[PDB]
């Protein structure tokens, strides 16, 4: 099904103004963002969601700064970007679930502090 060039974990420090959690699908065949549905999970909660069919991003209030670059979706890039204030109290394992046309897969990335 869907494949990723997965990463074990990413680290950020005090110098990190914003953090970026990587998520790259290697075998995407979607030609339109309307065929893509991306959901980022943290501790069993949808902390980010991209509805391709409705072209809208959805975030809870504790992840107000969480967003992805939509223009990079069709290239397989579904990396999540947020500010340090939202990442400080949210260290742990993030799940990047990507729904692409007929196929669906997910990968787990860990966000740790140093």
């Amino acid at each position, epitope marked *: 099904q869907l494949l990723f060039n997965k990463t074990k974990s990413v680290e950020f420090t005090f110098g990190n103004d914003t953090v970026v959690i990587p998520c790259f699908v290697t075998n995407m065949e979607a030609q339109n963002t309307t*065929e893509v*549905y991306v*959901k980022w999970k943290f501790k069993g909660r949808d902390i980010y*969601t991209f509805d391709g*069919a*409705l072209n809208k991003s*959805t975030v*809870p209030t504790d992840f107000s700064s969480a967003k992805i670059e939509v223009s990079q979706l069709l290239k397989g890039d579904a990396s999540l970007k947020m500010d340090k204030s939202d990442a400080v109290s949210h260290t742990g394992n993030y799940t990047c679930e990507v729904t692409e046309l*007929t196929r669906e897969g997910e990968t787990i990335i860990e966000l740790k502090y140093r």
Partner: antibody
Amino acid sequence: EVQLVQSGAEVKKPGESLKISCKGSGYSFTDYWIGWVRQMPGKGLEWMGIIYPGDSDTRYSPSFQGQVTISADKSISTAYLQWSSLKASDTAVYYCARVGRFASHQLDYWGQGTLVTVSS
Amino acid sequence: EIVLTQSPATLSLSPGERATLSCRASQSVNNRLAWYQQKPGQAPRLLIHWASTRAIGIPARFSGSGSGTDFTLTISSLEPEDFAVYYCQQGASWPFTFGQGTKVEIKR
């Protein structure tokens, strides 16, 4: 638990205005799309439109655009379906429902429905 | 608009037999299809989403299959509490649409 309670049955006359409501509870109301479905007597389901209570982003079906107004109030977690001039053909059962956060946009939870009767 | 056509209009089957409900679309919806059941005087009830994925609390007798245009809802063993109207719904493209509906009546 997730619950969607709609307003009671309405009996109106043609040309009158009407505003039916749907209050959600047991979940974050501002983070899920709310859809309105019309079911005329002995007929199938009709998707009227959806609204995202977070920013009041409203999407209408082409058959209902300009014929009805959909709004929401974050302060009391309530979605609204409003007419400015009712017709006899508006006589139907109206359901509010929560759109699941999935690619299929299915409706996992439904209201009890609001029976609207319009005649002279 | 993506038109959803269900077939047949009415299925007359005996309790215990299996039911095969079809749902055709004007174009590809890519598994983004949902199934519902509706009993008289009651709101629709979610059965299947993502074409094949069963919902929480849904009996195993209900099954979903198909991708793109042709889709199918399957009921292995018909129970007395299964004879009702069934709808199909697509969520790939806005406006989201329902099917005409298929009624399953008891055959005697």
